[PDB]
Subunit: 66 residues, 2 copies
């Protein structure tokens, strides 16, 4: 995506940013905690640009492991 | 049960399981990719116990070492 691409994620991973670190940068950590418990909070979080970016980064880091 | 608890999460963190490692263990990464352009698919994915466990672990790792 325009705001978080391939090359930007490579820079984040070189910096040692974990998925959880990036969620904190996004100010999403507490919302994620609420989403694990509440279907309403989950559905709301799932519609966000911030969660889209977070999940993008998560798959990127997994593909660069092992 | 399949749902997480804090002792399970402590064990995972001691073993060095990262959040993305846990997504891979749950076989969620393909599903995450697939749901990125569908509201419905994302909603369905968020309704799964697997996704809820992943998000619980993400917050756990954020608050623990
Ligand atoms: Br983006
Ligand atoms: Br960003
Ligand atoms: Br939200
Ligand atoms: Br944003
Ligand atoms: Br780590
Ligand atoms: Br699903
Ligand atoms: Br859970």
């Amino acid at each position: 995506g325009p705001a978080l691409n391939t090359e930007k994620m490579k820079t984040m991973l070189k910096a040692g940013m974990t998925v959880d670190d990036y969620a904190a940068k996004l100010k999403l950590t507490d919302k994620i905690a609420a989403a694990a418990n509440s279907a309403r909070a989950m559905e709301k979080l799932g519609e966000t640009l911030k969660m889209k970016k977070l999940l993008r980064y998560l798959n990127y880091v997994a593909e660069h492991t092992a």
